[PDB]
């Protein structure tokens, strides 16, 4: 369920992420900056259907943020890429956590799964796909 996602995560690898950020409309400074980040996540949950994610994106953007949501309930988001009017919703599909953002008539999706102990996110904006993986801290 949601329990398996809980706790701290640190980035392990990233592919095509700047290109994804450009595709969702981020300015070049932020897409190139975002591509270089090494984020840390702190995930917490309540009741198996509420989550809070605190993110330290890290250098070179140095943006910290958080999202808080209930599964199935749309919420407003103000992401680092500066898109306006973003409406987000998160739901489970099997063992995967699927996060959809809608803004300006467009949609983008993040699919999150645990694979051999790593948190793997696949990001899709139209034909542009990216992937990032996170690991647990050893201490
Ligand atoms: C299991 C549930 C789960 C959730 C809900 C989750 C959410 C999540 N993951 C990230 C990293 C993070 N950061 C960014 C984007 C940026 N980073 C930068 O420093 C800049 C400038 C940009 C934009 C230009 C994205 C698109 C993501 C989502 C992909 C990821 O999780 O790595 C953020 C920060 C997004 C932002 O800064 O706007 C959020 C809310 N991660 C999880 O593992």
Curated annotation (Swiss-Prot):
Q: Which SUPFAM superfamilies match?
A: Lipocalins
Q: One Pfam family, please name it.
A: Lipocalin
Result when mutating residue 57 to A: Abolishes fluorescence emission
* ATP-binding listed as a keyword: no
Q: State whether keyword Translocase applies.
A: no
What subcellular compartments does it reside in? Cytoplasm
To what use is this protein put?
Becomes fluorescent upon binding free, unconjugated bilirubin, a heme metabolite. Can be used as diagnostic tool to detect abnormally high levels of free bilirubin, which are indicative of impaired liver function. Could also be used in research as fluorescent marker in eukaryotic cells and animals.
- What Gene Ontology terms describe where this protein resides (cellular component)? cytoplasm
For this chain, one GO molecular function annotation is: lipid binding
In the record, biological process GO terms are: bioluminescence
Where does the entry say this protein is expressed, by tissue?
Answer: Detected in small-diameter muscle fibers from the white muscle layer from juvenile animals (glass eels) (at protein level). Detected in small-diameter muscle fibers from juvenile animals (glass eels).
Q: Which superkingdom? A: Eukaryota
Residues binding (4Z,15Z)-bilirubin IXalpha:
57, 61, 80, 112, 132-134
- What are the record keywords, sorted? Cytoplasm, Luminescence, Photoprotein
Q: What is known of its domains?
A: Forms a beta-barrel structure that accommodates bilirubin in its interior.
As for what it does, the entry says:
Beta-barrel protein that binds unconjugated bilirubin with high affinity. Excitation of the bilirubin-bound protein gives rise to green fluorescence, both under normoxia and hypoxia. The apoprotein is not fluorescent. Does not emit fluorescence in the presence of ditauro-bilirubin, urobilin or biliverdin.
Family designation: Belongs to the calycin superfamily. Fatty-acid binding protein (FABP) family.
Subunit structure of this entry?
A: Monomer.
According to UniProt, the name of this protein is Bilirubin-inducible fluorescent protein UnaG
The lineage is:
Eukaryota, Metazoa, Chordata, Craniata, Vertebrata
């Amino acid at each position: 369920m949601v329990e398996k996602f809980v706790g701290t995560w640190k980035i392990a690898d990233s592919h095509n992420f700047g290109e994804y950020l450009k595709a969702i409309g981020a300015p070049k400074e932020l897409s190139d900056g975002g591509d270089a980040t090494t984020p840390t996540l702190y995930i917490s949950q309540k009741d198996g259907d509420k989550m809070t994610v605190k993110i330290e994106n890290g250098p070179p953007t140095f943006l910290d943020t958080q999202v808080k949501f209930k599964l199935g309930e749309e919420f407003d988001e103000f992401p680092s890429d500066r898109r306006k009017g973003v409406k987000s919703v998160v739901n489970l599909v099997g063992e995967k956590l699927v996060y959809v953002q809608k803004w300006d008539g467009k949609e983008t999706t993040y699919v999150r799964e645990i694979k051999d102990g790593k948190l793997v996110v696949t990001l899709t904006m139209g034909d542009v796909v990216a992937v990032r993986s996170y690991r647990r801290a050893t201490e």
